[PDB]
Symmetry: C2
Subunit: 353 residues, 2 copies
């Protein structure tokens, strides 16, 4: 009768929503089962199992240090055991691990199971476009939504106020109240006083913003680094928002314009990304120094990557196979500056209408 929730991922973002979910399961005992399972890929810190470190003193010592986890958030090293007659699966693993997790879950989940994908962005390249939520559905046979917004795992964990959008299309095989998941169940599952949740249907809209915003953030960084200021940056954000809407309606049609300017996953996530982050910082240094993206990527983010560098190439490849490159001058301009040696100062002329 009540909904059993499992989180598949355990990382930064994985541990953090699993806490969000565990706090709501305790908060609504008539709706959700008391215990929340979290799939942790077994690792040993100082010869001690990570799964047991979490199952008292309640801290993900490696991926989320200093954050006290509820009591009902139980770590599980077995993927199939964590899924043992689950109702709601919250997918929170890096994109490169999705094919592994899906192949391992095939024939072990359940037709009744409904899922939510916390994986930001979508699949884009020369061969086509695909939502990661749709990959889950066609490799598991389960209904799958998305969670995305202007948020960072570190801030949500420290209970710093931010928002998120949760998108889910109610399926045909729905049977209502205390039996299946609707927008009320999803609102109760994720909403916290420090984490405002808006529940919608548009899974496509929420998803494309998560990737495309990073291409726009590069254009803002270029413009900031050149010393053009806030007004020039705000102009790229406006042009960028328009290109995100255009991309969504062209390839997912399907998608509501409203999602892009009304939701956290849209406009708010674009604003925060263009204000500060990996993509804007790398682009700003490219303009300051004159070094190429990857030189700047190495210098500032050491380990990690500015995902917009990959996205602008992938979007370009998809648009070349569509014959729709002319329709997105900002996306094209960012690609031309990053990969080829386009002047950067020519950005206004390239986007000029």
């Amino acid at each position: 009768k009540p909904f059993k929730v499992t989180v598949i991922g355990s990382g930064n973002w994985g541990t953090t929503i699993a806490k969000v979910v565990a706090e709501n399961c305790k908060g609504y005992p008539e709706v959700f089962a008391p215990i929340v399972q979290m799939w942790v890929f077994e690792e040993e810190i100082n010869g001690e199992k990570l799964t047991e470190i979490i199952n008292t003193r309640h801290q993900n010592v490696k991926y989320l240090p200093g954050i006290t986890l509820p009591d009902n958030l139980v770590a599980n090293p077995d993927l199939i055991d964590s899924v043992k007659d689950v109702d709601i699966i919250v997918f929170n693993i890096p994109h490169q691990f999705l094919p592994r997790i899906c192949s391992q879950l095939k024939g072990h989940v359940d037709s009744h199971v409904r899922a939510i994908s916390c994986l930001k962005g979508f699949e884009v390249g020369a061969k086509g476009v695909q939502l990661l939520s749709s990959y889950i559905t066609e490799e598991l046979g389960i209904q799958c939504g998305a969670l995305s917004g202007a948020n960072i795992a570190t801030e949500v964990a420290q209970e710093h106020w931010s928002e998120t959008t949760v998108a889910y299309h109610i399926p045909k095989d729905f049977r209502g109240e205390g039996k299946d998941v609707d927008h009320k169940v999803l609102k109760a599952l994720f909403h916290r006083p420090y984490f405002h949740v808006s529940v919608i249907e548009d899974v496509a809209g929420i998803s494309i913003c998560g990737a495309l915003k990073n291409v726009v953030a590069l254009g803002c960084g270029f413009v900031e680094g050149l010393g053009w200021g806030n007004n020039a940056s705000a102009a790229i954000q406006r042009v960028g928002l328009g290109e995100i809407i255009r991309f969504g309606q062209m390839f997912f049609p399907e998608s509501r314009e409203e999602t892009y300017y009304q939701e956290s996953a849209g406009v708010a996530d674009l604003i925060t990304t263009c204000a500060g982050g990996r993509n804007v910082k790398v682009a700003r240094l490219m303009a300051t120094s004159g070094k190429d993206a990857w030189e700047c990527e190495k210098e500032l983010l050491n380990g990690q990557s500015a995902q917009g560098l990959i996205t602008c190439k992938e979007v370009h490849e998809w648009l070349e196979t569509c014959g729709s490159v002319e329709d997105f001058p900002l996306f094209e301009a960012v690609y031309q500056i990053v990969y080829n040696n386009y002047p950067m100062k020519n950005l206004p002329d390239m986007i000029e209408e």
Copy 2:
């Protein structure tokens, strides 16, 4: 036959817009008359006349120093002489001088004259709402549009790339091509490679943004100063944008939602204002110190004011007479914090949906 253009202004924005217009008049000799007149309220410098300082060596030494003005930008101390059968009037003076300029132009303009107001914002209070372009139309009997975007006179003058929206409803009195002004004439009049122009109809939409953005910028400052970061700020911008749309469509129902998220006057102007400026800076200090607004206004802005402080009171008064206070929780929250002594930390609970 060609369009004679006059700018009523001479200040920061006035001289800058007159430079933009003079550049385009020289650029389109088949559309506009060669000379552009600029009304300058006579003042003496080195005991010298400001009007003659501009009419060679072409510099507004007091209001726009270091900026070389074309050749065809002629300063005029006589209001009526500057309007000497003129086709297009560009109003660019501070809000407090609009009743003076209008009362002095009454019975001296000409019915065929079309105008553009560069005066940001609109009139709001307990008694009602009014566009300042509508005040011009009701006092002069001339059609009047608006010019607003994410821009600063200083940057546009320096030819630093930015954008603007120009809004104008084509009237019933319209003739067509080389006889009257349409969106093509307005695009040619204001568009520059360093100043991108988008021409629309929605005069109401672009006007309300110019005032309301400062109420939102206060909410961002509060949230930043509390140490909640970019994600919390982006959330207030998202909520704020929604409240600007809601306000526009409630009180100027002929307003298009599109204007708010597609145009420079909308989303871009909101982004730049919330990123940096008087309103965000004062609000940030209010959170940092704990002093009241005006104590913070004196400490940073010296001989300048954060308009949003007045606007949040004026909007509240209008909403009280409408009985629509509940519909705008963010606008109400900003008010309550500024005027009364509302905790500021309660901002998420006040806007919670």
